[PDB]
Amino acid sequence: VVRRELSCESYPIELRCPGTDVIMIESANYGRTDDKICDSDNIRCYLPDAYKIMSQRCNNRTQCAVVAGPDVFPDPCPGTYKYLEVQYECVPYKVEQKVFLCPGLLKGVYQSEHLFESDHQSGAWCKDPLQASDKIYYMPWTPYRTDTLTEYSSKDDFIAGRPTTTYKLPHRVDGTGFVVYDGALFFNKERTRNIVKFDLRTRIKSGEAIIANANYHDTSPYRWGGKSDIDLAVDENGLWVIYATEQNNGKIVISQLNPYTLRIEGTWDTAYDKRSASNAFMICGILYVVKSNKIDYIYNTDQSKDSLVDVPFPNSYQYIAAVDYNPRDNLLYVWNNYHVVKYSLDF
Amino acid sequence: VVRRELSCESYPIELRCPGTDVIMIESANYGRTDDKICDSDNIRCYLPDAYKIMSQRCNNRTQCAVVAGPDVFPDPCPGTYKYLEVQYECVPYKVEQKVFLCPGLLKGVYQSEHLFESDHQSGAWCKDPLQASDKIYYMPWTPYRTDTLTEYSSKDDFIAGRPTTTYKLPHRVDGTGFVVYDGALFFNKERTRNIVKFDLRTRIKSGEAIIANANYHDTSPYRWGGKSDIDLAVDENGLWVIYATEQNNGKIVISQLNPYTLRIEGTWDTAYDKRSASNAFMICGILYVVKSNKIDYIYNTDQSKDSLVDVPFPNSYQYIAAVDYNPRDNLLYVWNNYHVVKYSLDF
Amino acid sequence: VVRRELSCESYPIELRCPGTDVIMIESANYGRTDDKICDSDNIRCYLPDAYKIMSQRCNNRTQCAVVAGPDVFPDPCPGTYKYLEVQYECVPYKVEQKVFLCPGLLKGVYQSEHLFESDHQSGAWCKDPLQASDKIYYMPWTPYRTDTLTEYSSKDDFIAGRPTTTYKLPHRVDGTGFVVYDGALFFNKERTRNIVKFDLRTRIKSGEAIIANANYHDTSPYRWGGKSDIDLAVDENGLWVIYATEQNNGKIVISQLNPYTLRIEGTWDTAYDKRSASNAFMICGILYVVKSNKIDYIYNTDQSKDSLVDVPFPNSYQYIAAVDYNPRDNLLYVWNNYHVVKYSLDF
Amino acid sequence: VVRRELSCESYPIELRCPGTDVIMIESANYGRTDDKICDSDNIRCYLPDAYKIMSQRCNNRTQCAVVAGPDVFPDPCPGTYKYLEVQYECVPYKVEQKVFLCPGLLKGVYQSEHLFESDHQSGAWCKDPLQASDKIYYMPWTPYRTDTLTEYSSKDDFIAGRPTTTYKLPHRVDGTGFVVYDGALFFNKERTRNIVKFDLRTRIKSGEAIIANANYHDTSPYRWGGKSDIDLAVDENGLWVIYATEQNNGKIVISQLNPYTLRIEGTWDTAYDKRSASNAFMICGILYVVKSNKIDYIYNTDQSKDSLVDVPFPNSYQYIAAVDYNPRDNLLYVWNNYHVVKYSLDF
Ligand SMILES: *[C@@H]1O[C@H](CO)[C@@H](O)[C@H](O)[C@H]1NC(C)=O
Ligand SMILES: *[C@@H]1O[C@H](CO)[C@@H](O)[C@H](O)[C@H]1NC(C)=O
Ligand SMILES: *[C@@H]1O[C@H](CO)[C@@H](O)[C@H](O)[C@H]1NC(C)=O
Ligand SMILES: *[C@@H]1O[C@H](CO)[C@@H](O)[C@H](O)[C@H]1NC(C)=O
Ligand SMILES: [Ca+2]
Ligand SMILES: [Ca+2]
Ligand SMILES: [Ca+2]
Ligand SMILES: [Ca+2]
Ligand code: NA
Ligand code: NA
Ligand code: NA
Ligand code: NA
């Protein structure tokens, strides 16, 4: 929706966008286009650079204050009493285009970072790839008692055990399949085949989606168990759901979930038994299944074709609780038998 | 609607309200009430003064930033890792209670201030009594060509002819009957018996009300004419409409208009011919009619009783274009034959 | 905000307002004003009655469907392919003007209706005077356990004990001082000097107001006690708060509360000790205090003048728990020692 | 956001969603879970099928009315006075999953339907693939005078020249590159490198996106010219922008545009000169370039790989003004030298 501001010469113009939304200049003029605006003692006074000046000073910002005068703008009509007229919009914060571009085909998964050894055998952690932020999101695994999400301002604060805040979730969580995308938490509602969307900035449930025919609550989890039936994943294409159905004889089923409309945007049936998989993740719309040790299966959703592979994966620890791909830094956010680690990817 | 913020010890809590809305602390606790919030190495840790500290620091403000720690709060439980949990609302800016309290019964109208002599014989001007501001709103009278409202930051800037901004109205204006109340402009839409509500902060029409059976467009104006058929008025009770109907044989009819719901909240029929009145205004729900020179008639809406009076009014100039009462400063904002003046009131 | 609809000849126009909001036609034309609208094989084709037809068919309705054709509209230009263009707004439902007009000065309170004898000694009940509805709202009094409001579709259903719905309140209630106004419940939040606004249609808290310096939780209740410290009241002027302050030595203090902005719009200090009052209510901005038996004191907020009176009140029962005035039907909604009654008023 | 309804036995529950949004049942119970709800003369009374009954009766509907009683629900506790308690959300209308699934690789483009021969040599037309509707959207090409979009209820009404409505656009349109997606019109704003989003249901601009470095206004159009610089396209992946940049030496550049966030989600540089292309379109994230006669070039965005091809295209007419792919019916919506046609696709 179009927002409007106008200030007479020597007065500032004030632009402000709600929450995390940012300014986008639609139009701007410094001069005079009307004989009634800004009462004083030439209605064809235009400054073509007014649009450029306002865009440079205000675009990508939550707020802007610009004085309508000679300190900021050249004079398009000396002698004429001028005014600054601006039309603008509040748009979601911009995202670096690399987040949506495929880095290539996965050659292997390798050790990279070892953050710390937690006192919890299972759990999950990630970053929001749509944000240029150092924020880490952490959800520990406690059977039948998980309903919180802890936020850390950096990796350094995360290792030191220094949280910024904690979120009380509207429902209990089943498994370690959680993801954070564009300021929203996505999780599997305990004892349901539903995904809950929880807005972190306003601390309220912003929606719910039913994952049609998805098996739930220790019916089709990963090898380790722990109610891992439904796993969410983020990649270059958006948000995904990794689960299994009786219709597909307990084999992995993958669906694209629109994070804004909560619609299921395409479903693909794989040939890999979910109970046999230690974990799984998406990269460029391709499902990578972990066996434990190695990636032994891939499913390409773009071609609707699968293949048997022998892609390396770290053999260090046994209890693989969570594996989350990040399309911003191209790293795997892993929870493996108490150890909180980051794995590099070779393309 | 309830808004929530939470920050772990040493981190700041950030409260922000949209537009001109202000913070109201609902609840606050600095301590520990839950064993899962703010992950670290006593769930009955309360600070009773947390509510008082937050209220003092954040109430009546657009924004607030408070660090959850020993610089701002005492320690309710030394050794326990604490967090600040706050529940708050965004409410319209508070108004000094005097604005709604009757100063008394009017003894007379007297000269007080003479701002300047305009080049326009007719027009109208006022301040928003619900705002603690020096802002002046000005609408000149130009037959069939009025569609702007000019704003000045102070009396000083108004006399000097230094405007802050100008508003382009969605429709043309009939007469000098305009008023500003709680950030909204109220005016009579040209060639209609309708009142338009225009939000000044967002620069959009926020509503419309039809003044049932009101005479319009030089049918029942004030003595001077100029399409003065419908006059808006602000007092201790709110917003009023001063007009005339054929049902009341062209005599003044007064209605209370709710500025928030746009409903007509009571209508009273007077015995004064509107065409004979130079102008009129409300004080404490009492209509005061000007003849030119003197106030010769009053109508009390609380009692539904009228009386003939001889209340003094300045005899200086003839062409009385506008008379607007202000319940904050208890002054009359008058436009009389080019002269822009303020009249004092003796109670 | 302006809403727009347009349909080519023979097609229907569909107008819809959210919730309880109603249509108000701003403008309408059946004909042709543009050479590009409604593509077919005269751009000055107007029907003046189009505005009248649309207003008659759509005003005061939640929804409207009108066919753009000869069954509903005359032909302003035969041969020319026409279209119906409408501009409209969604406004709060209209209210009969009598609700805001003073019936007169109270001569006495008299018995009228005896609905039923409840099993609860104390409680409160009312109707929403801003709605043309038979709905009754009921709140029983249970010490430290009150957090529900029950709704009945009629008097008949209320006596029979046939509820339509129950509302779970966000907080516990202190006393029997509750009121319903313009679809919103107003109550005193347990162990606070705060008034909570709860929207009944959406079932959420819509705001909160602090009653500055108000005594609360068995400090200054009515004679019967039961945490009656703060009593809400509805009359021709709007919403009121009846309470007491230490600043006024425990004597009744009355404040106008804006139900839309949650602002305190004027405060008046009375000379009647609240602990000595059995109950109190407002009519035309005048406070009427009950002693038990009789009305022995009045306070006129319009004049800021009080008087000692001897106004009759029914002597039938002793334990007067609640007295709520209704400005639509001009009756008192009373709860007296198990008996749920309506009292008439002589003006 | 969660919406709540509750009705006591024999009373109906009413669920309504705004605009085109549909109901999604979150939770439902017919019975008794609380001793205070629905006042009458067992707080563990549950009906497991209540969720199933409500979902079946209300899911995918704008509105729902269900009576809380024995005509619709079995009795989970005879003798106990029951109530129906429902929690629900309003979600965007569901979309058939085929719209997001790739039909295969394009073997050729073939003649299928010939609707009519227009009096306009150039123009554009389409359907909204996210809607299960017969609605056709039409924009004729008139140099420097295009600012309207006409809607037809069916193919039959479109051929007959019987429109339902016309939309007045906030800005003039450059070229025939328009698209309709999820109730929103997307077009290139005249003399700019910007895409405007216009909501058809509310008739207002809902956003704007700048296509960084895009050539505009007869700099890089298709062979026929007519300000075709920027072309929008819809496929299984969403919304795309087909344009050219000086950085890519006037060769086709393709970008994914998020229709909800207005963000550019990935950009790919092709090797095909845009001025040499008659038109272009996307299918499964693959760009197909038309030469006139044949498809002689493809660019796969999933692989970031291009190939020279010889894919058939109808040789019937010369002046190819628009080619729009539809992912619901897998047809090309084409405007070729006055003729309005549909082309089939062989996979
Ligand atoms: C700021 O806004 C401009 C305007 O479109 C956009 O092009 C740019 O990508 C955004 N991000 C940055 C870092 O400038
Ligand atoms: C700030 O907020 C408090 C909280 O109710 C209110 O009492 C006060 O009147 C308002 N205004 C000022 C100037 O403090
Ligand atoms: C319907 O709308 C009209 C338009 O202003 C209004 O005058 C009238 O009072 C309202 N109420 C009824 C019952 O018509
Ligand atoms: C109705 O709602 C259900 C609930 O998720 C959904 O599964 C289904 O796909 C939607 N569409 C139809 C045609 O039922
Ligand atoms: Ca995973
Ligand atoms: Ca006046
Ligand atoms: Ca009372
Ligand atoms: Ca195309
Ligand atoms: Na996951
Ligand atoms: Na006025
Ligand atoms: Na009350
Ligand atoms: Na297009």
Short mmCIF file of C-alpha atoms in Angstrom, two decimals, chain C residues 4-339:
data_model
loop_
_atom_site.label_atom_id
_atom_site.label_comp_id
_atom_site.label_asym_id
_atom_site.label_seq_id
_atom_site.Cartn_x
_atom_site.Cartn_y
_atom_site.Cartn_z
CA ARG C 4 -15.01 -0.05 -4.82
CA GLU C 5 -17.18 -2.35 -6.96
CA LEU C 6 -18.03 -2.27 -10.68
CA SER C 7 -20.10 -4.62 -12.84
CA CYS C 8 -20.96 -4.46 -16.53
CA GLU C 9 -24.61 -4.59 -17.63
CA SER C 10 -26.55 -7.81 -16.65
CA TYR C 11 -23.92 -8.76 -13.99
CA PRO C 12 -24.41 -8.39 -10.20
CA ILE C 13 -22.43 -6.07 -7.91
CA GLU C 14 -21.49 -7.66 -4.54
CA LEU C 15 -20.92 -5.51 -1.42
CA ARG C 16 -19.84 -7.10 1.89
CA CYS C 17 -18.76 -5.61 5.24
CA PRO C 18 -16.73 -7.53 7.90
CA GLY C 19 -18.26 -8.65 11.22
CA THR C 20 -21.11 -6.39 12.47
CA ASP C 21 -20.06 -3.42 10.20
CA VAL C 22 -22.70 -2.10 7.74
CA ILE C 23 -22.71 -0.60 4.20
CA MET C 24 -22.86 3.14 3.54
CA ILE C 25 -23.13 4.15 -0.14
CA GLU C 26 -20.70 7.02 -0.88
CA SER C 27 -21.38 7.27 -4.65
CA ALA C 28 -23.07 5.25 -7.40
CA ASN C 29 -23.62 5.53 -11.14
CA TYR C 30 -25.47 3.34 -13.57
CA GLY C 31 -24.51 4.33 -17.11
CA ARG C 32 -21.22 5.26 -18.84
CA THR C 33 -18.58 7.81 -17.70
CA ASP C 34 -15.54 6.25 -19.50
CA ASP C 35 -14.87 4.89 -23.05
CA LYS C 36 -12.61 2.00 -21.82
CA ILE C 37 -14.82 0.46 -19.06
CA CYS C 38 -16.79 -2.69 -20.05
CA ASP C 39 -15.52 -3.49 -23.61
CA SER C 40 -18.22 -3.76 -26.34
CA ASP C 41 -19.07 -2.69 -29.97
CA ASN C 42 -21.51 8.21 -24.98
CA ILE C 43 -19.28 8.98 -21.94
CA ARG C 44 -21.86 11.43 -20.42
CA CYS C 45 -24.52 8.84 -19.37
CA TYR C 46 -25.69 9.48 -15.76
CA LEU C 47 -28.57 8.17 -13.62
CA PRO C 48 -29.11 10.54 -10.63
CA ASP C 49 -31.34 7.96 -8.83
CA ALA C 50 -28.50 5.31 -8.88
CA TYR C 51 -27.21 6.73 -5.55
CA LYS C 52 -30.79 6.56 -4.06
CA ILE C 53 -31.44 2.99 -5.35
CA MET C 54 -28.09 1.68 -3.98
CA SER C 55 -28.55 3.49 -0.60
CA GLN C 56 -32.10 2.07 -0.19
CA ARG C 57 -31.00 -1.45 -1.21
CA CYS C 58 -27.62 -1.62 0.64
CA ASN C 59 -27.41 0.88 3.58
CA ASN C 60 -27.47 -0.67 7.13
CA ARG C 61 -26.80 -4.16 5.72
CA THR C 62 -23.81 -6.48 6.28
CA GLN C 63 -24.07 -7.57 2.61
CA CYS C 64 -25.68 -6.52 -0.71
CA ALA C 65 -26.10 -8.00 -4.23
CA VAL C 66 -27.59 -5.75 -6.97
CA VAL C 67 -27.86 -6.68 -10.69
CA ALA C 68 -26.63 -3.89 -13.05
CA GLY C 69 -29.66 -3.86 -15.34
CA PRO C 70 -33.26 -3.02 -16.29
CA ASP C 71 -34.84 -5.09 -13.45
CA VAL C 72 -33.38 -2.72 -10.81
CA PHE C 73 -32.44 0.50 -12.71
CA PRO C 74 -34.11 2.75 -15.35
CA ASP C 75 -32.25 3.23 -18.66
CA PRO C 76 -30.35 6.59 -18.69
CA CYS C 77 -29.03 5.99 -22.28
CA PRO C 78 -30.81 3.33 -24.46
CA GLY C 79 -28.43 1.79 -27.01
CA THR C 80 -25.30 2.45 -24.90
CA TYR C 81 -23.74 -0.58 -23.07
CA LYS C 82 -23.83 0.47 -19.40
CA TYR C 83 -22.08 -0.41 -16.11
CA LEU C 84 -22.77 0.09 -12.41
CA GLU C 85 -19.91 1.89 -10.54
CA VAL C 86 -20.20 2.15 -6.73
CA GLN C 87 -17.99 3.63 -3.98
CA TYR C 88 -18.88 2.61 -0.40
CA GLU C 89 -17.67 2.31 3.20
CA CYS C 90 -18.10 -0.17 6.05
CA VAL C 91 -19.29 1.67 9.16
CA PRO C 92 -20.33 0.48 12.69
CA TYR C 93 -24.05 -0.52 12.87
CA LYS C 94 -26.39 2.48 13.32
CA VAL C 95 -27.95 3.23 16.75
CA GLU C 96 -31.47 4.67 17.44
CA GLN C 97 -30.93 8.30 18.54
CA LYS C 98 -33.20 7.95 21.69
CA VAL C 99 -30.31 5.97 23.43
CA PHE C 100 -28.35 9.31 23.66
CA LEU C 101 -31.30 11.59 24.64
CA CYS C 102 -32.14 12.38 28.29
CA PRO C 103 -35.66 11.15 29.27
CA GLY C 104 -35.81 13.71 32.10
CA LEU C 105 -35.18 14.05 35.85
CA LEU C 106 -35.78 10.96 38.03
CA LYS C 107 -38.92 11.21 40.25
CA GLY C 108 -38.55 7.63 41.57
CA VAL C 109 -37.57 3.95 41.12
CA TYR C 110 -40.43 1.39 41.04
CA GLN C 111 -40.99 -2.37 40.79
CA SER C 112 -41.78 -3.56 37.23
CA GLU C 113 -40.55 -7.09 36.39
CA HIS C 114 -39.54 -10.11 38.52
CA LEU C 115 -37.73 -12.56 36.21
CA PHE C 116 -36.70 -15.40 38.62
CA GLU C 117 -35.09 -16.17 42.00
CA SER C 118 -31.52 -17.43 41.39
CA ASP C 119 -29.60 -19.83 43.70
CA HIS C 120 -26.86 -17.11 43.89
CA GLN C 121 -27.34 -14.28 46.49
CA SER C 122 -25.10 -11.94 44.45
CA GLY C 123 -24.40 -11.40 40.75
CA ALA C 124 -24.99 -8.99 37.85
CA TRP C 125 -26.92 -8.85 34.55
CA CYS C 126 -27.55 -6.43 31.64
CA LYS C 127 -28.28 -5.88 27.93
CA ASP C 128 -26.13 -3.98 25.37
CA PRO C 129 -28.07 -0.67 24.88
CA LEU C 130 -26.23 0.15 21.64
CA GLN C 131 -27.72 -3.02 20.05
CA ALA C 132 -31.34 -3.61 18.90
CA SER C 133 -31.20 -7.11 20.42
CA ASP C 134 -32.97 -9.29 23.04
CA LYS C 135 -29.56 -10.64 24.27
CA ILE C 136 -28.96 -10.80 28.05
CA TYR C 137 -25.48 -10.96 29.62
CA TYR C 138 -25.06 -12.66 32.98
CA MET C 139 -22.14 -12.82 35.46
CA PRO C 140 -22.68 -14.70 38.77
CA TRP C 141 -20.71 -13.75 41.90
CA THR C 142 -18.41 -16.43 43.33
CA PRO C 143 -15.62 -15.11 45.64
CA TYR C 144 -12.12 -15.39 43.98
CA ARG C 145 -13.55 -17.75 41.22
CA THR C 146 -15.29 -15.40 38.68
CA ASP C 147 -13.91 -15.54 35.07
CA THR C 148 -16.95 -16.26 32.82
CA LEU C 149 -19.80 -14.32 31.15
CA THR C 150 -22.93 -16.18 29.97
CA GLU C 151 -25.11 -14.93 27.07
CA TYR C 152 -28.86 -15.66 26.57
CA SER C 153 -30.74 -14.90 23.31
CA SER C 154 -33.86 -13.56 25.14
CA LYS C 155 -35.56 -12.87 28.55
CA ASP C 156 -37.57 -16.11 27.96
CA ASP C 157 -34.35 -18.16 27.45
CA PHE C 158 -32.75 -16.42 30.49
CA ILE C 159 -35.59 -17.38 32.92
CA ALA C 160 -35.67 -20.97 31.48
CA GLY C 161 -31.86 -21.25 31.96
CA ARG C 162 -31.15 -21.82 28.24
CA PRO C 163 -27.81 -20.10 27.35
CA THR C 164 -26.58 -19.43 23.78
CA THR C 165 -22.86 -19.22 24.75
CA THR C 166 -20.30 -18.58 27.54
CA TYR C 167 -17.18 -16.41 27.36
CA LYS C 168 -13.96 -17.39 29.15
CA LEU C 169 -12.45 -14.12 30.37
CA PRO C 170 -8.66 -13.40 30.13
CA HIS C 171 -8.56 -12.50 33.88
CA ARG C 172 -10.58 -13.07 37.06
CA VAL C 173 -13.28 -10.44 37.93
CA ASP C 174 -13.52 -8.40 41.12
CA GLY C 175 -17.13 -7.62 42.02
CA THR C 176 -20.48 -7.27 40.22
CA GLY C 177 -19.68 -3.95 38.47
CA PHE C 178 -19.55 -5.32 34.88
CA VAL C 179 -21.24 -3.65 31.86
CA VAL C 180 -21.66 -4.50 28.10
CA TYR C 181 -21.38 -1.60 25.58
CA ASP C 182 -21.19 -1.70 21.75
CA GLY C 183 -20.30 -5.44 21.59
CA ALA C 184 -17.63 -5.11 24.29
CA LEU C 185 -17.56 -6.37 27.88
CA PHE C 186 -16.06 -4.02 30.51
CA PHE C 187 -14.96 -5.43 33.90
CA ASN C 188 -12.66 -4.84 36.89
CA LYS C 189 -9.55 -7.10 36.71
CA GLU C 190 -9.18 -9.04 40.03
CA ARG C 191 -6.81 -7.41 42.62
CA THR C 192 -6.20 -4.30 40.38
CA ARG C 193 -7.57 -0.76 39.80
CA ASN C 194 -7.86 -1.67 36.06
CA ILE C 195 -10.78 -2.00 33.64
CA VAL C 196 -10.50 -4.67 30.93
CA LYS C 197 -12.23 -4.31 27.53
CA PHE C 198 -13.12 -7.72 26.02
CA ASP C 199 -14.55 -7.92 22.47
CA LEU C 200 -17.42 -10.46 22.52
CA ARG C 201 -17.57 -11.10 18.70
CA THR C 202 -13.83 -12.00 18.37
CA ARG C 203 -13.40 -13.30 22.02
CA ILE C 204 -10.20 -11.31 22.77
CA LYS C 205 -9.04 -8.53 25.12
CA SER C 206 -9.22 -5.31 23.06
CA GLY C 207 -7.66 -3.01 25.67
CA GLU C 208 -7.03 -1.98 29.29
CA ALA C 209 -7.37 1.26 31.28
CA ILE C 210 -5.92 2.06 34.72
CA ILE C 211 -8.34 3.95 36.98
CA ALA C 212 -5.79 6.32 38.58
CA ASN C 213 -5.86 6.27 42.43
CA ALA C 214 -8.96 3.98 42.53
CA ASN C 215 -9.28 1.91 45.73
CA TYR C 216 -9.62 -1.84 44.99
CA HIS C 217 -10.17 -5.38 46.43
CA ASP C 218 -12.43 -4.78 49.52
CA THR C 219 -10.92 -1.30 50.28
CA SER C 220 -13.92 0.80 49.12
CA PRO C 221 -16.76 -1.57 48.01
CA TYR C 222 -20.53 -1.08 48.38
CA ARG C 223 -22.15 -1.88 51.81
CA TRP C 224 -22.65 -5.61 50.92
CA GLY C 225 -18.88 -5.96 50.19
CA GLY C 226 -17.98 -8.68 47.65
CA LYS C 227 -15.07 -6.71 46.06
CA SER C 228 -17.59 -4.09 44.68
CA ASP C 229 -14.84 -1.37 44.80
CA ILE C 230 -15.21 -0.36 41.12
CA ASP C 231 -18.59 -0.25 39.33
CA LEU C 232 -19.06 0.44 35.60
CA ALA C 233 -22.12 2.31 34.33
CA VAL C 234 -23.71 3.08 30.96
CA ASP C 235 -25.98 6.08 30.18
CA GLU C 236 -26.89 8.60 27.39
CA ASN C 237 -23.29 10.01 27.51
CA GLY C 238 -21.44 6.68 27.31
CA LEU C 239 -19.34 4.64 29.76
CA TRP C 240 -18.60 5.64 33.37
CA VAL C 241 -16.56 4.30 36.30
CA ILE C 242 -17.97 4.59 39.88
CA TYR C 243 -15.24 4.09 42.50
CA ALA C 244 -13.52 5.80 45.48
CA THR C 245 -10.03 7.25 46.27
CA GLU C 246 -8.01 7.91 49.48
CA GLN C 247 -7.44 11.46 48.03
CA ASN C 248 -11.26 11.89 48.33
CA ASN C 249 -11.28 10.16 51.83
CA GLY C 250 -13.07 7.01 50.56
CA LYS C 251 -15.94 9.07 49.06
CA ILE C 252 -17.42 8.24 45.61
CA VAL C 253 -15.38 9.45 42.62
CA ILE C 254 -16.89 9.29 39.12
CA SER C 255 -15.00 9.21 35.81
CA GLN C 256 -16.10 9.07 32.18
CA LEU C 257 -14.25 6.29 30.32
CA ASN C 258 -14.07 6.46 26.52
CA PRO C 259 -14.99 2.91 25.33
CA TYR C 260 -13.07 3.38 22.02
CA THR C 261 -9.88 5.24 23.09
CA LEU C 262 -9.71 3.91 26.74
CA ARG C 263 -9.02 7.51 27.95
CA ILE C 264 -10.41 8.94 31.21
CA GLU C 265 -12.53 11.90 29.92
CA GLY C 266 -13.19 13.93 33.09
CA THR C 267 -13.24 13.10 36.83
CA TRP C 268 -15.64 14.39 39.54
CA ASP C 269 -15.25 14.10 43.36
CA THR C 270 -18.49 13.49 45.32
CA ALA C 271 -19.26 13.81 49.09
CA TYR C 272 -20.88 10.33 49.58
CA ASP C 273 -18.91 7.61 51.46
CA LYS C 274 -18.82 4.56 49.10
CA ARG C 275 -18.84 1.99 52.01
CA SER C 276 -22.21 3.56 53.12
CA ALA C 277 -23.77 3.17 49.61
CA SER C 278 -25.68 -0.06 48.80
CA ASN C 279 -25.18 0.71 45.07
CA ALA C 280 -25.13 3.62 42.53
CA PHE C 281 -25.91 4.34 38.82
CA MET C 282 -25.75 7.13 36.16
CA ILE C 283 -28.66 8.72 34.21
CA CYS C 284 -27.99 11.80 31.94
CA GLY C 285 -24.55 12.31 33.56
CA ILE C 286 -26.14 12.41 37.03
CA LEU C 287 -24.99 9.96 39.74
CA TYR C 288 -27.82 8.43 41.82
CA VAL C 289 -26.70 6.81 45.12
CA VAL C 290 -28.82 4.03 46.73
CA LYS C 291 -29.13 3.72 50.55
CA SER C 292 -30.67 0.63 52.28
CA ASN C 293 -34.73 1.68 50.48
CA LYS C 294 -34.18 5.21 48.98
CA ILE C 295 -32.00 7.42 46.72
CA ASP C 296 -30.63 9.95 49.26
CA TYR C 297 -27.94 11.67 47.11
CA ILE C 298 -27.34 12.91 43.56
CA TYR C 299 -24.28 14.39 41.79
CA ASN C 300 -24.75 16.31 38.51
CA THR C 301 -21.48 16.09 36.47
CA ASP C 302 -22.72 18.69 33.91
CA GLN C 303 -22.95 21.34 36.67
CA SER C 304 -20.42 19.74 39.14
CA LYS C 305 -23.18 20.18 41.79
CA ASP C 306 -24.60 17.70 44.32
CA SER C 307 -27.89 17.66 46.28
CA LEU C 308 -29.51 15.70 49.12
CA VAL C 309 -32.69 13.98 47.86
CA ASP C 310 -35.46 11.57 48.98
CA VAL C 311 -36.14 9.69 45.70
CA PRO C 312 -38.13 6.40 46.12
CA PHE C 313 -36.51 2.96 45.59
CA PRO C 314 -38.15 -0.52 46.17
CA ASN C 315 -38.00 -1.69 49.85
CA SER C 316 -38.71 -5.39 48.92
CA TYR C 317 -35.23 -6.99 49.50
CA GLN C 318 -32.06 -6.12 51.50
CA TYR C 319 -28.93 -7.55 49.71
CA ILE C 320 -28.58 -5.17 46.67
CA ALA C 321 -25.67 -6.73 44.67
CA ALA C 322 -25.99 -4.80 41.34
CA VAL C 323 -27.95 -1.89 39.78
CA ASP C 324 -27.37 -1.19 36.08
CA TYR C 325 -29.15 1.53 34.16
CA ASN C 326 -30.05 0.95 30.51
CA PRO C 327 -30.37 4.10 28.31
CA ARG C 328 -32.27 2.23 25.51
CA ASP C 329 -35.32 1.02 27.53
CA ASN C 330 -34.78 3.38 30.57
CA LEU C 331 -34.93 0.47 33.08
CA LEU C 332 -32.70 -0.63 36.01
CA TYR C 333 -31.20 -4.14 35.72
CA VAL C 334 -31.02 -5.19 39.36
CA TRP C 335 -29.71 -8.16 41.39
CA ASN C 336 -31.20 -8.11 44.89
CA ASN C 337 -30.82 -11.01 47.42
CA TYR C 338 -31.17 -13.95 44.94
CA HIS C 339 -33.93 -12.07 42.97
#
